[PDB]
Amino acid sequence: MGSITENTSWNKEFSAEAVNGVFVLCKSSSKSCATNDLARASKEYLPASTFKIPNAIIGLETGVIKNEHQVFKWDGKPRAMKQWERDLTLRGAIQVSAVPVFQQIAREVGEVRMQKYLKKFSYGNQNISGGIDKFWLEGQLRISAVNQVEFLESLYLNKLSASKENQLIVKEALVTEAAPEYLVHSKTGFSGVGTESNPGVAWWVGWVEKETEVYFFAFNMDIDNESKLPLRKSIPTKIMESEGII
Amino acid sequence: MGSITENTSWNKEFSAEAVNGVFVLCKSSSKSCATNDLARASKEYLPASTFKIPNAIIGLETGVIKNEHQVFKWDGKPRAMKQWERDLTLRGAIQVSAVPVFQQIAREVGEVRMQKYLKKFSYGNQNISGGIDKFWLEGQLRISAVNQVEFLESLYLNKLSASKENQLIVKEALVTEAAPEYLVHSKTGFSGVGTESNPGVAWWVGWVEKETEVYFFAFNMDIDNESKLPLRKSIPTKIMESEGI
């Protein structure tokens, strides 16, 4: 990555909520990044559902996901969340974080192909052991906020080791906010409430295209209570809108 | 164009506003469309800004538009609108409908290549005479609502005679509404108030991806009073809502 500068004043938003976390924000027009905590910016955590971004690209690249219009049919069996009990498009599955859809995609991709692509993507520690359908949820895979922004910037520029076509498909699927001159691509993540002395992690990563400017961001925080989930978006949002990226 | 059925009940919104226009809605699931007026559905009108869709694709295909990240720098010379007086990305130019930006692109594309692609796209009457950079604004180019829908369906499916990459680039630049299971791609159009007994035309075309269903739409109406523009969105919205979309 380029240069990164620690800005301890950003901790203001974290203190107010008594949250232990990190936010990394990079402005493309300068190749510079800022963060409230340099140490945690480089610390690696379970990616949780933010892993659906590389998983989607790999699914497309390997042909497991036939094309952008593939519909993932619900077999009718009970699923962990009601929002997943329905047929979903690739964008739909990603947007509602439909774990079972991507677990099946991961099984079809397989260990060998999955490993190959995470190496090509320089994705975290590239550790997929423990079970092909859950390594990003409870396995040994880990990735840092800094590595997330590097990865997302590559995707934005279509520089990942995959077809431009597939990177573009996954990119539209990640759009979460659209205005004439304000476009946001993002993905949430939540590993769970963790265990005693081992909190879970919550994520919010993506990028913002405001006019001719582009900002890449990655946020993660320790979490042991679902009631704190909204903070994964509110803290980053307050930090960015305090930076003029309203 | 699969099958199309006229549904006069849709005229309600039109009559309720004393507006002459047409709306074509197609449900991909069941290759069928509906319209309030079959005859007008096939009538061709000046595309106005909706033409920025085919133009953007052509600009990318021919190279005039370097890539998806190309920036369109403003030279400083005043423009018809303040919103266009600034640098713009490809999506920004489309979203705010920066006429000057695309006029320049058209010039670079060249009437020869422009004519070539409109033939590949089967875009309306394909008449770009009058002025290489104003034919869609006041030239003789004409296209129907049915033609807009089939053109947009081709784009959605990456079936236009262009690279899938360029089609995908233009598709994201057209996103106007984004939600978890609701995504809208769309483009507005307006030729002006026009002249007496010869009003202008207002457009609104695009498609809606709701859950796993996909709806393609095209709307146009005659307009002589700039105060009626909002109707290009309100009328279709009301009709689609009355359908469940």
Curated annotation (Swiss-Prot), chain B:
Compartmental location: Periplasm
Cellular-component GO terms for this entry: periplasmic space; plasma membrane
Enzyme class at the top of the EC tree: hydrolase
Pfam families: Transpeptidase
Residues reported to bind a beta-lactam: S97, T188, F190, R232
Disulphides: C26-C33
Keywords: Antibiotic resistance, Disulfide bond, Hydrolase, Periplasm, Plasmid, Signal, Transposable element
Effect on the protein of changing F135S: Increases resistance to ceftazidime about 30-fold in P.aeruginosa strains PA01 and PA14
Keyword ATP-binding: no
Positions where N6-carboxylysine occurs in the chain: K52
InterPro entries associated with the record: Bact_Transpept/Beta-Lactamase (IPR050515), Beta-lactam/transpept-like (IPR012338), Beta-lactam_class-D_AS (IPR002137), PCN-bd_Tpept (IPR001460)
Protein task: Class D beta-lactamase which confers resistance to the beta-lactam antibiotics, including penicillin, carbenicillin and oxacillin, and also some cephalosporins. Confers weak resistance to some carbapenems, in E.coli strain C600Z1. Acts via hydrolysis of the beta-lactam ring. Has penicillin- and cephalosporin-hydrolyzing activities.
Subunit structure, interactors included: Dimer.
Family (UniProt): Belongs to the class-D beta-lactamase family.
The name this protein goes by in its record: Beta-lactamase OXA-10
Protein's organism: Pseudomonas aeruginosa
Lineage: Bacteria, Pseudomonadati, Pseudomonadota, Gammaproteobacteria, Pseudomonadales
